[PDB]
Swiss-Prot record, chain A:
Protein's name according to its UniProt entry: Selenide, water dikinase
UniProt GO BP: selenocysteine biosynthetic process; tRNA seleno-modification
Binding residues annotated for Mg(2+), in chain numbering: 39, 79, 215
SUPFAM superfamilies per UniProt: PurM C-terminal domain-like, PurM N-terminal domain-like
Annotated EC: 2.7.9.3
Catalytic activity as recorded in UniProt: hydrogenselenide + ATP + H2O = selenophosphate + AMP + phosphate + 2 H(+)
NCBIfam families: PRK00943.1, selD
Chain positions of site Important for catalytic activity: 8
Length: 335, 319
């Protein structure tokens, strides 16, 4: 009943570079997981177990309060799964304009959060809330991961196949909802895609063959895959059609619903990409709120993994491969 | 105000603190170690950006100490009117936060930020405690003596400075008091006889005390004289200097308290942003608690006691 209060959901609002640069520097340690550019902190307990701490929150992406809460919680929890961790708890983060919106609605948002948490196997353990001019919801999530998984960090490798657990286009569908979103299966499909919890990541990390694992969110596929190629000093080749896509995204893109986030993404990652046709570019730069997992996996597993994806029923999309860096070739090139 | 969690239904363990209200969530790994998570965030409570950062952070970490935990991580919560206030102001607040974090022996590790019409800053903080050493706010028992680790009167000083009623001798005291870290909590956790512990923040001493009593099914008797107060907080309360949050507090729990005069009421219900630890301690451990507190430069005398419930919830040996 109101993604109407946000307002302006892109892209100077969520994690504005400017602000994002405030991680700073340091090395007193036990803290192995975020001192620099990272989106999560990780602390080694020394017994072979590390605690993960991660936070994310935003303004309403959808009009339905329950769904908004589910999605935001799902997105916040994804960060633990994408490092191959297990969430053990979560606490709510809520700003709400009480002089404007009733506490009933706010409760709906929170119940959404609680639902998404239950899907992750945890409880929403309370939280903190304040009066704010614009609604803000998210979580601070805590997790555990074996210390070996973080301390030995692949580093994907040349020869790796590239896999995607969710189709792309979330940004464009939500943008198409601004107006021109059509009634057909373009109703609620983006919500359903966002609310798929990345729970299988925790299992994917128990495999050696998979060299790199990240979640594709907000930097878009271009940004996340480019980041995966930056470490490992390797380039990427992607089949642009193998690429799982939401129903009717290209129609919405060529008809013009592209969030400003994609532009911000192109300004950041565009030089790493070949010169590309506008619609394709808008697809690759599309921020994915609560997107899926990008996997860099090699053959000795092409199936072991695959199995697993099947066990969680996600299975699964091959979009391309990783090649050793060669000259004159783009870091990520599209075919 | 909020109440927005719980709920209808539920999921369970090994969540130890939750969900009624304790200061922080705690989860039991079966290895003798529990993990604590808490978050807190605010709109600016002072002019100085750096000190605002310092204070919001101190307040957020306080809840780990109230559980008797040791802080390990902190992550920033920030929202900022990028078209209104400068990013350099933001870095100053953040720097306040990093400094406070360092005072708790931890790094401020990244965070999340958004554009928000009004400035908001706080932390999500993570801590650890041996499982059997957790100190909930609800586990007190009759016979306990009460202790308080910071003197009262923060709100009255903040509003006296806001109303230009602050005497020159008192400049910046409230800020220094606020920025004192509740680190002693992590040591009180080692005392078997410390039955319960919480922090006094903004709900007022009487509010948090009421939470202890409700939680434990007991009642309290407090001695107004014995309660540590900030210099000229009494005098500043007379012709206050009595912030609007105070009457919100007395509206909330006032029906649970005995008769007390205007000024007394106003001091005891006064919001303390980032205030002291409030402890319930069995007589056998009193000594240890006082000596442990002494290590951290805190001199302690009982402010009252916990008795079996009969009459009104908290009574003041008023004055
Ligand atoms: Mg992520
Ligand atoms: Mg507290």
């Amino acid at each position: 009943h109101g993604a109407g209060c946000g307002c302006k959901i892109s892209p100077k609002v969520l994690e504005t570079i400017l602000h994002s640069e405030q991680a700073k520097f340091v090395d007193p340690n036990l803290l192995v997981g975020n001192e620099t550019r990272d989106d999560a902190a990780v602390y080694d307990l020394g017994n072979g177990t590390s605690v993960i701490s991660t936070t994310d929150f935003f303004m309403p992406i959808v009009d339905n309060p329950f769904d908004f809460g589910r999605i935001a919680a799902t997105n916040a929890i994804s960060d633990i799964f994408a490092m191959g961790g297990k969430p053990i708890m979560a606490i709510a983060i809520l700003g709400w304009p009480i002089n404007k919106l009733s506490p009933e609605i706010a409760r709906e948002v929170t119940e959404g959060g609680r639902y998404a948490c239950r899907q992750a196997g945890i409880a929403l353990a309370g939280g903190h809330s304040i009066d704010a001019p614009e609604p803000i919801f998210g979580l601070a999530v805590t997790g555990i991961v074996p210390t070996e998984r973080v301390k030995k960090n692949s580093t994907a490798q040349a020869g790796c196949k590239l896999f995607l657990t969710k189709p792309l286009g979330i940004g464009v569908l939500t943008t198409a909802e601004k107006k021109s979103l059509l009634k057909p299966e373009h109703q609620g499909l983006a919500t359903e895609v966002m609310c798929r919890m990345n729970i299988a990541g925790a299992s994917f990390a128990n495999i050696e063959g998979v060299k790199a694992m990240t979640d594709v969110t907000g930097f878009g596929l271009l940004g996340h895959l480019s980041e995966m190629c930056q470490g490992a000093g390797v380039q990427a080749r992607v089949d642009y059609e193998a690429i799982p896509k939401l129903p009717g995204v290209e129609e919405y893109i060529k008809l013009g619903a592209v969030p400003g986030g994609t532009e911000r993404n192109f300004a950041s990652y565009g030089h790493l990409m070949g010169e590309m046709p506008r619609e394709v570019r808008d697809l690759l730069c599309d921020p994915q709120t609560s997107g899926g997992l990008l996997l860099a996996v090699m053959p000795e597993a092409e199936n072991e993994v695959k199995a697993t994806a099947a066990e969680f029923g996600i299975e699964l999309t091959a979009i391309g491969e990783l090649v050793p860096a060669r000259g004159g070739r783009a870091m990520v090139e599209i075919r």
